[PDB]
Amino acid sequence: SEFEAVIKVISSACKTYCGKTSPSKKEIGAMLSLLQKEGLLMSPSDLYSPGSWDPITAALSQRAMILGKSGELKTWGLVLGALKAAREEQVTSEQAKFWLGLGG
């Protein structure tokens, strides 16, 4: 499954761009698993695409208000910070070229 690999990747990004606090792999999975259940993420890689970021935020916000469940929103806040960091701080395609180069 794409799923447990995406947890790895995200967990990597947070250790690097996640200043201070960082979330647990349990917490990241919880976020992801919910997002799949709620029908937002069709595949867990779709979360890297920025198209999805505003929608997610909105939806996890609703959840904190309506159902009083904010744990996953907190995760997403940390996580998104890392994604944006990473997008600004690097050239996207060059960083990918590097990874596939190592692949052999």
mmCIF file of C-alpha atoms in Angstrom:
data_model
loop_
_atom_site.group_PDB
_atom_site.id
_atom_site.type_symbol
_atom_site.label_atom_id
_atom_site.label_comp_id
_atom_site.label_asym_id
_atom_site.label_seq_id
_atom_site.Cartn_x
_atom_site.Cartn_y
_atom_site.Cartn_z
ATOM 1 C CA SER A 1 0.000 0.000 0.000
ATOM 2 C CA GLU A 2 0.999 3.585 -0.776
ATOM 3 C CA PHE A 3 -0.228 4.331 2.823
ATOM 4 C CA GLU A 4 2.581 3.235 5.211
ATOM 5 C CA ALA A 5 5.176 4.645 2.771
ATOM 6 C CA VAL A 6 3.487 8.048 2.763
ATOM 7 C CA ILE A 7 3.620 8.021 6.555
ATOM 8 C CA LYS A 8 7.409 7.424 6.257
ATOM 9 C CA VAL A 9 7.873 10.282 3.825
ATOM 10 C CA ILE A 10 5.871 12.734 5.775
ATOM 11 C CA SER A 11 7.581 11.709 8.972
ATOM 12 C CA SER A 12 10.889 12.451 7.194
ATOM 13 C CA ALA A 13 9.720 15.859 6.060
ATOM 14 C CA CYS A 14 8.645 16.822 9.584
ATOM 15 C CA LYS A 15 11.936 15.845 11.205
ATOM 16 C CA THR A 16 13.637 18.121 8.665
ATOM 17 C CA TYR A 17 11.255 21.047 8.147
ATOM 18 C CA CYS A 18 9.243 20.466 11.293
ATOM 19 C CA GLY A 19 10.816 22.985 13.620
ATOM 20 C CA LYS A 20 10.249 22.238 17.344
ATOM 21 C CA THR A 21 7.236 19.940 17.919
ATOM 22 C CA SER A 22 6.869 17.038 15.568
ATOM 23 C CA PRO A 23 4.077 14.491 15.259
ATOM 24 C CA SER A 24 4.024 10.744 15.756
ATOM 25 C CA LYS A 25 3.622 8.182 13.037
ATOM 26 C CA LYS A 26 0.470 6.953 14.886
ATOM 27 C CA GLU A 27 -0.925 10.549 14.693
ATOM 28 C CA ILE A 28 -0.087 10.939 10.964
ATOM 29 C CA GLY A 29 -1.789 7.636 10.100
ATOM 30 C CA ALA A 30 -4.835 8.688 12.138
ATOM 31 C CA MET A 31 -5.037 11.888 10.103
ATOM 32 C CA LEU A 32 -4.574 10.047 6.814
ATOM 33 C CA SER A 33 -6.958 7.237 7.656
ATOM 34 C CA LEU A 34 -9.704 9.683 8.589
ATOM 35 C CA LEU A 35 -9.140 11.686 5.419
ATOM 36 C CA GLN A 36 -9.598 8.493 3.352
ATOM 37 C CA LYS A 37 -12.768 7.568 5.335
ATOM 38 C CA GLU A 38 -14.240 11.015 4.883
ATOM 39 C CA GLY A 39 -13.754 10.712 1.103
ATOM 40 C CA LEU A 40 -11.281 13.591 0.737
ATOM 41 C CA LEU A 41 -8.172 11.614 -0.142
ATOM 42 C CA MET A 42 -8.700 8.977 -2.799
ATOM 43 C CA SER A 43 -5.069 7.921 -2.661
ATOM 44 C CA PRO A 44 -2.775 9.014 0.163
ATOM 45 C CA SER A 45 -0.225 10.646 -2.221
ATOM 46 C CA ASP A 46 -2.941 13.140 -3.345
ATOM 47 C CA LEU A 47 -2.122 14.962 -0.077
ATOM 48 C CA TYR A 48 1.195 16.191 -1.426
ATOM 49 C CA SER A 49 -0.621 18.083 -4.213
ATOM 50 C CA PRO A 50 -1.445 21.639 -3.066
ATOM 51 C CA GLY A 51 -4.915 21.472 -4.685
ATOM 52 C CA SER A 52 -5.929 19.503 -1.620
ATOM 53 C CA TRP A 53 -4.602 21.759 1.146
ATOM 54 C CA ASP A 54 -7.360 24.361 1.463
ATOM 55 C CA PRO A 55 -10.150 21.679 1.334
ATOM 56 C CA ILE A 56 -8.465 19.606 4.009
ATOM 57 C CA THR A 57 -7.985 22.514 6.324
ATOM 58 C CA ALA A 58 -11.669 23.488 5.980
ATOM 59 C CA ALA A 59 -12.858 19.966 6.590
ATOM 60 C CA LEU A 60 -10.675 19.226 9.600
ATOM 61 C CA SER A 61 -11.795 22.618 10.969
ATOM 62 C CA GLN A 62 -15.452 21.615 10.665
ATOM 63 C CA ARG A 63 -14.602 18.455 12.497
ATOM 64 C CA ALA A 64 -13.067 20.344 15.437
ATOM 65 C CA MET A 65 -16.169 22.476 15.719
ATOM 66 C CA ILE A 66 -19.037 20.162 14.967
ATOM 67 C CA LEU A 67 -17.769 16.983 16.687
ATOM 68 C CA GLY A 68 -15.243 18.550 19.032
ATOM 69 C CA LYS A 69 -12.403 16.442 17.566
ATOM 70 C CA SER A 70 -9.303 18.473 16.925
ATOM 71 C CA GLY A 71 -6.446 15.973 17.265
ATOM 72 C CA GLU A 72 -6.145 15.400 13.544
ATOM 73 C CA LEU A 73 -6.408 19.076 12.669
ATOM 74 C CA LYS A 74 -3.446 19.689 15.016
ATOM 75 C CA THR A 75 -1.463 17.077 13.122
ATOM 76 C CA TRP A 76 -2.386 18.644 9.792
ATOM 77 C CA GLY A 77 -1.251 22.068 10.990
ATOM 78 C CA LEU A 78 2.210 20.742 11.877
ATOM 79 C CA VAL A 79 2.354 18.741 8.664
ATOM 80 C CA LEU A 80 1.250 21.457 6.301
ATOM 81 C CA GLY A 81 3.860 23.777 7.806
ATOM 82 C CA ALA A 82 6.477 21.288 6.679
ATOM 83 C CA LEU A 83 5.098 20.915 3.222
ATOM 84 C CA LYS A 84 5.091 24.675 2.641
ATOM 85 C CA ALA A 85 8.552 25.031 4.127
ATOM 86 C CA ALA A 86 9.800 22.424 1.770
ATOM 87 C CA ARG A 87 8.063 23.846 -1.298
ATOM 88 C CA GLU A 88 9.606 27.333 -0.634
ATOM 89 C CA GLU A 89 13.005 26.254 0.508
ATOM 90 C CA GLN A 90 13.812 23.884 -2.485
ATOM 91 C CA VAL A 91 13.452 23.497 -6.234
ATOM 92 C CA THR A 92 10.908 20.766 -6.613
ATOM 93 C CA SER A 93 12.059 18.902 -9.732
ATOM 94 C CA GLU A 94 15.744 19.038 -8.827
ATOM 95 C CA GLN A 95 15.088 17.418 -5.499
ATOM 96 C CA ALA A 96 13.131 14.650 -7.281
ATOM 97 C CA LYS A 97 15.906 14.175 -9.845
ATOM 98 C CA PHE A 98 18.210 13.546 -6.917
ATOM 99 C CA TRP A 99 16.019 10.861 -5.411
ATOM 100 C CA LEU A 100 15.515 8.945 -8.635
ATOM 101 C CA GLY A 101 19.259 9.207 -9.363
ATOM 102 C CA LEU A 102 20.034 7.232 -6.175
ATOM 103 C CA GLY A 103 17.535 4.571 -7.117
ATOM 104 C CA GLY A 104 19.707 2.719 -9.638
#
